[PDB]
Amino acid sequence: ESLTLQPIARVEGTVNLPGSKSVSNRALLLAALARGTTVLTNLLDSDDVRHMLNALSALGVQYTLSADRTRCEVTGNGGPLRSAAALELFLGNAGTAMRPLAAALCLGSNDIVLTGEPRMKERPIGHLVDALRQGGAQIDCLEQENYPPLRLRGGFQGGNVEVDGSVSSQFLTALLMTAPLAPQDTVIVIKGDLVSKPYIDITLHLMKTFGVEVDNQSYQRFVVRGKQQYQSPGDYLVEGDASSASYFLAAGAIKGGTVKVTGIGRNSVQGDIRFADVLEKMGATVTWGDDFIACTHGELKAVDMDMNHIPDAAMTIATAALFAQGTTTLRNIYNWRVKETDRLFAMATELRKVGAEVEEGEDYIRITPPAKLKYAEIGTYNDHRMAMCFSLVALSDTPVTILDPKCTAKTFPDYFEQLARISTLA
């Protein structure tokens, strides 16, 4: 079960990004809590988002989906979700559902178990559970502390709580979304440094779109007034994941043509939009649009840059360097080693197969492209990023075979078909 990509002469066109899973689940939850009816456009249809919808429906939240499931109108509860029966909700493998719902269902006086697949029951959630119990939530870890399944009997007060931001930002995100509906003001102190601050930015912006301000003190203390209620904005467009645009912007830079991506824009708070600036430095032409970003081909030159700030689209720079003149160095990317799997090793290994000369430093990667690309079966490591990164190899006279291509279905099942639509094959 692989997908062989035939060589592409040239690409040019428009690609609409589906919704971010992150944004999609956050917005569904806030619309479920909000006063009024929210219309969500560009919603992601993934099975994680399905579990989020099925959970909300089991919670009594009424909504209607479009035929293609990318448009959803939600009748907001105007308050904490209430369930008169005990529930047990299976969230599959949707942590971006598990975490926000774990926090939000500490509101009220319910009795709900959250669980999912063994992979998720292996994803730690104790940093969130501690903070919630600290503000008064009754949470019972039915098998083991730090991980689902979770029995949630509510009771979240607010008050002085702490959360560890050193491992994941998503714990803080779940806390922040829940806090405004607590009876007390909530003061959230971050233990160490805060990882992944732009996702925090995303969550805060969504919350403000729903009418709730937060005092963010240097990403070290967050003050949320209690007693509030979210107000529907009416329409809300779910913005596509910024990392997913990187592959098509790189496609245009390499072998356009011009590639325009919609679902993202010049004024997005997502960090990885800054990917585009890197292509501009490599010689490509970037046009910064309001609800789109476009890349037109210029002669690509290699770059030497700290990529600390864009960990997910930096991988895309690693494959696009195969087409730039010179040796590219991607610096301060130790983040890649401390992941689910070591991306630095993985990217080096799979780059060497297509002919590249790869240095694997402690926290950097140095890439010298081959004079001629080689055909290879690229292992993708359960990582949709890998599949989408090495899909660019066909932007040459050389095919490439991607292994486990369905790993992209997680965030972009239509990735290759859209890639195809903008392609002219050699």
Task: Tell me: is residue 221 an annotated ligand-binding position.
Answer: no
| Helices 47-58 and 21-33, axial angle in degrees (round to 10) | 10
208 is in an annotated binding site: no
Any known ligand binding at 410?
yes
What is the 3-state composition of the chain as percent helix, strand, coil, each rounded to the nearest 5? 35, 25, 40
Which DSSP state fits 248? Answer: H
C-alpha 5: how far from chain center: 26
Which spans in 256-292 are helix H?
A: 275-281
Backbone angles phi and psi of 117, in degrees to 5: -75, 160
Residues 19, 21, 22, 27, CA torsion sign: positive
Is 391 annotated to bind ligand?
no
Distance CA 271, CA 196 (A): 9
Cβ neighbours of residue 417 closer than 8 Å, sequence gap 6 or more: none
First to last CA, the chain: 24
Backbone angles phi, psi at 47, to 5 degrees: -75, -20
DSSP-based three-state secondary structure for 247:
helix
Answer left, alpha or beta for residue 218, where phi above 0 means left and psi between -120 and 50 means alpha. Answer: left
Sign for the CA dihedral angle at 51, 71, 29, 187 comes to: positive
**Declared resolution, Å:** 1.7
List Cα–Cα distances, 113 to 13, 57, 91, 119, 163, in angstroms: 46, 15, 11, 17, 22
Q: Which residues face 190 on adjacent strands? A: 163
Strand order in the sheet with 186-190: 159-163, 186-190, 221-224, 215-217
What would the CATH number be for the domain defined by 2-18+239-425?
A: 3.65.10.10
On whether 151 is known to bind a ligand per the annotation, the reply is no
Domains 2-18+239-425 and 21-237 share a fold: yes
Question: Is 109 labelled as part of a ligand binding site?
Answer: no
57 labelled ligand-binding? no
- Which residues does 44 contact at the CB level (< 8 Å), separation at least 6? 18, 19, 20, 21, 24, 70, 238, 411
Q: 69 is written with which tokens? A: 């499931």
CA nearest 95: which of 69, 72, 122, 62? 122
Q: How far apart are CA 261 and CA 212, in angstroms?
A: 30
Active site residues: 312
Whether 91 and 51 have beta carbons less than 8 Å apart is answered as yes
What whole-number distance in Å separates Cα of residue 353 and Cα of residue 346? 11
**Is 268 annotated among the ligand-binding residues?**
no
Q: Is 345 helix (H, G, I), strand (E, B) or coil?
A: helix
Going by C-beta distance under 8 Å and a sequence separation of 6 or more, which residues neighbour residue 99? 125, 128, 170, 171, 173, 174
Contact 54, 63 (CB under 8 A): no
Q: Is 197 annotated as contributing to ligand binding?
A: no
352 is in an annotated binding site: no
The distance of Cα 23 from the centroid of its chain, to the nearest Å, equals 8
DSSP state of 231: B
CA nearest neighbour of 366 among 319, 330, 315: 330
Q: How far apart are CA 325 and CA 187, in angstroms?
A: 51
Residue that has been written with the tokens 């078909």 in this structure = 417
Q: How far apart are CA 320 and CA 307, in angstroms?
A: 14
Which residues of 267-356 form beta strands (DSSP E)? Answer: 285-288, 292-296, 304-306, 328-331
21-237 CATH, one of 3.40.50.11900, 3.65.10.10, 3.30.450.30, 3.40.190.10? 3.65.10.10
For strands 159-163 and 186-190, give the pairing: parallel
Give SS3 for 191: coil
161, 160, 158, 162: which is closest to 183 by C-alpha? Answer: 158
For residue 315, CA distances in Å to 47, 196, 290, 308 come to: 25, 17, 25, 11
Q: Domain extents for the chain?
A: 2-18+239-425, 21-237
**How many CB atoms lie under 10 A from the CB of residue 86?**
11
